[PDB]
Amino acid sequence: SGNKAAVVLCMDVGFTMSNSIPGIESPFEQAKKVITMFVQRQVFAENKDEIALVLFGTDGTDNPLSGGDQYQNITVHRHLMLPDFDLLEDIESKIQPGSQQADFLDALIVSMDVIQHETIGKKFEKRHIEIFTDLSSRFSKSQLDIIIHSLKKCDISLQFFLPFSLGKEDGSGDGPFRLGGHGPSFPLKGITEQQKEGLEIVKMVMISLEGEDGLDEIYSFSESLRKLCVFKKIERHSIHWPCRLTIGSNLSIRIAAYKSILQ
Amino acid sequence: SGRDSLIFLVDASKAMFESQSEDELTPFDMSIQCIQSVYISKIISSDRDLLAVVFYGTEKDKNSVNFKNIYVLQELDNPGAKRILELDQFKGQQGQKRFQDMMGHGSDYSLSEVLWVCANLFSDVQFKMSHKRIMLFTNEDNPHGNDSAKASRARTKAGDLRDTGIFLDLMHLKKPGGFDISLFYRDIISIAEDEDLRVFEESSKLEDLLRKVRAKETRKRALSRLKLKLNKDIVISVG
DNA sequence: GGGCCCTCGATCCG
DNA sequence: CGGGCCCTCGATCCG
DNA sequence: CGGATCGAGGGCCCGATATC
DNA sequence: GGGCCCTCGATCCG
DNA sequence: CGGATCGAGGGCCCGATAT
């Protein structure tokens, strides 16, 4: 009787996330702030939804796929389950930045394995993965075709969160920076050719999954904090009820109305 | 030419120690004796087969990557007198007591992790493995029926093993109400790629277990490959 | 002396 | 077992 | 200086509901 | 609650 | 010594039903 959904937050904790740009909170602290915001809403509203947490670029390896020397810097901190206060306390202070770097696509595969195995039976209505990275780490394009195929077959939606915001398609996208502020919320020159290459791959993947408008699902940590886009994919239909628009006599259009705006 | 690798996987759950109200040895006792018989036969025959004995569902865990509840009693190595003597400590009703004392039983396991350790055991062999085979001795027809995650992960790792070249053969033991392949073991076990599916029945006697084990024991070894010439032009090849 | 039998050694294939 | 509705109190200011 | 008003409580109908 | 259907058990004759 | 019969089992629809 309620909209359930399996959400897995895939956070980059690599050393480079600890690398901080003057004035701006380090992408690690920025992603942490966004994750805490998400979990906080899911916890205090007591919504029935299970949340898993995967961290990539950690010093150690605790992952089911670690067999084979593969994914040795990806740790599944939280398995798919209803979020609790212990999880919020761990995100707030227990989870510390790591010294290694991982392949963000490899981490995405770990998250996918979590969804594929812990979602058995129509227990969950929606499947969603949220990647939090800076793209500064090198990566391999080997299974990208398979990643996209497995995402479609499993019906899992994606959402990317970077320290920088999408520059305007043509022209435009540097003084003071304020997290959550409108406008100057990311260094225009801070992008690295490595970040640019990762971004092009991110763009292609989002377009391959949700078409041309998939690119709108790539946010910056700052703007993500001043929007409800983090819940977009797990957002519940407004409660609707049926009636009849009665014009006169004999004309009666069968309708169904819902509350568009409600405080 | 090459040395064959064979790993004996034995279930150590609460159900395995029950003699199903009969004169027959408990499925665990049946397994231990069957394994011992294979070891002796391998010593008698002149075959370079490397054997291993791995237990799962035990409280005490001893393995390469320290996975909980997995005890690798014997690594992949040639059969020896000392190895058979070690298995003899578990043979019988008195041996069951010796097993429960040395290591625990009926502990929560994870079949996914069990196959990971086993595959990692073949990884550590240097001589060319002609055949990789795992023989699962268990009486639980639907393990992890309650845990959905452990069951799907086990199905996935079984697929990964079949894609590697490892053979998975089931040695289902007496279960109250019969043993069902459809619940579990139907897809995990490796079936012949040219169909030949639903081929063996549940084992009740040691003689039956030994006959199924020894049938898939060694891969068919052709003495010679000759040409069967029906006519100057019609020639088929036979082994 | 003749049949018997077993154990190695030398000959080739998988 | 929920959803919308509506009223009754309680706390804040203006006349 | 009491009213007027608005957040945030409380109480009755009505489609899904395990129930005979 | 009402109709349905099947499977035994108890009742008598060949 | 089988039929016919009659309880008392089993499984799907439907007005009151706490939800």
UniProtKB/Swiss-Prot annotation, chain A:
Induction: In osteoblasts, by FGF2. Residues 6-225 form the VWFA domain. It comes from the Eukaryota. There is a cross-link at K189 (Glycyl lysine isopeptide (Lys-Gly) (interchain with G-Cter in SUMO2)). The modification Phosphoserine is found at S249, S252. ADP-ribosylated by PARP3. The modification N6-acetyllysine is found at K141, K259. Residues 135-162 are annotated as: Leucine-zipper. The EEXXXDDL motif is required for the interaction with catalytic subunit PRKDC and its recruitment to sites of DNA damage. The VWFA domain interacts with the KBM (Ku-binding motif) found in a number of DNA repair proteins. Individuals with systemic lupus erythematosus (SLE) and related disorders produce extremely large amounts of autoantibodies to XRCC6 and XRCC5. Belongs to the ku80 family. Heterodimer composed of XRCC5/Ku80 and XRCC6/Ku70; heterodimerization stabilizes XRCC5 protein. Component of the core long-range non-homologous end joining (NHEJ) complex (also named DNA-PK complex) composed of PRKDC, LIG4, XRCC4, XRCC6/Ku70, XRCC5/Ku86 and NHEJ1/XLF. Additional component of the NHEJ complex includes PAXX. Following autophosphorylation, PRKDC dissociates from DNA, leading to formation of the short-range NHEJ complex, composed of LIG4, XRCC4, XRCC6/Ku70, XRCC5/Ku86 and NHEJ1/XLF. (Microbial infection) Interacts with human T-cell leukemia virus 1/HTLV-1 protein HBZ. Single-stranded DNA-dependent ATP-dependent helicase that plays a key role in DNA non-homologous end joining (NHEJ) by recruiting DNA-PK to DNA. Required for double-strand break repair and V(D)J recombination. Also has a role in chromosome translocation. The DNA helicase II complex binds preferentially to fork-like ends of double-stranded DNA in a cell cycle-dependent manner. It works in the 3'-5' direction. During NHEJ, the XRCC5-XRRC6 dimer performs the recognition step: it recognizes and binds to the broken ends of the DNA and protects them from further resection. This is X-ray repair cross-complementing protein 5. The chain holds residues 4 to 269 of 732 of the full protein.
UniProtKB/Swiss-Prot annotation, chain B:
Induction: In osteoblasts, by FGF2. Phosphorylation by PRKDC may enhance helicase activity. Phosphorylation of Ser-19 does not affect DNA repair. Individuals with systemic lupus erythematosus (SLE) and related disorders produce extremely large amounts of autoantibodies to XRCC5 and XRCC6. Existence of a major autoantigenic epitope or epitopes on the C-terminal 190 amino acids of XRCC6 containing the leucine repeat. The majority of autoantibodies to XRCC6 in most sera from patients with SLE seem to be reactive with this region. Belongs to the ku70 family. This is X-ray repair cross-complementing protein 6. Single-stranded DNA-dependent ATP-dependent helicase that plays a key role in DNA non-homologous end joining (NHEJ) by recruiting DNA-PK to DNA. Required for double-strand break repair and V(D)J recombination. Also has a role in chromosome translocation. Has a role in chromosome translocation. The DNA helicase II complex binds preferentially to fork-like ends of double-stranded DNA in a cell cycle-dependent manner. It works in the 3'-5' direction. The modification Phosphoserine is found at S19. Signal peptide: none annotated. Forms a heterodimer with XRCC5/Ku80; heterodimerization stabilizes XRCC5 protein. Component of the core long-range non-homologous end joining (NHEJ) complex (also named DNA-PK complex) composed of PRKDC, LIG4, XRCC4, XRCC6/Ku70, XRCC5/Ku86 and NHEJ1/XLF. Additional component of the NHEJ complex includes PAXX. Following autophosphorylation, PRKDC dissociates from DNA, leading to formation of the short-range NHEJ complex, composed of LIG4, XRCC4, XRCC6/Ku70, XRCC5/Ku86 and NHEJ1/XLF. It is found in: Nucleus; Chromosome; Cytoplasm. Changing K132A: Abolishes adduct formation. It comes from Homo sapiens. It comes from the Eukaryota.
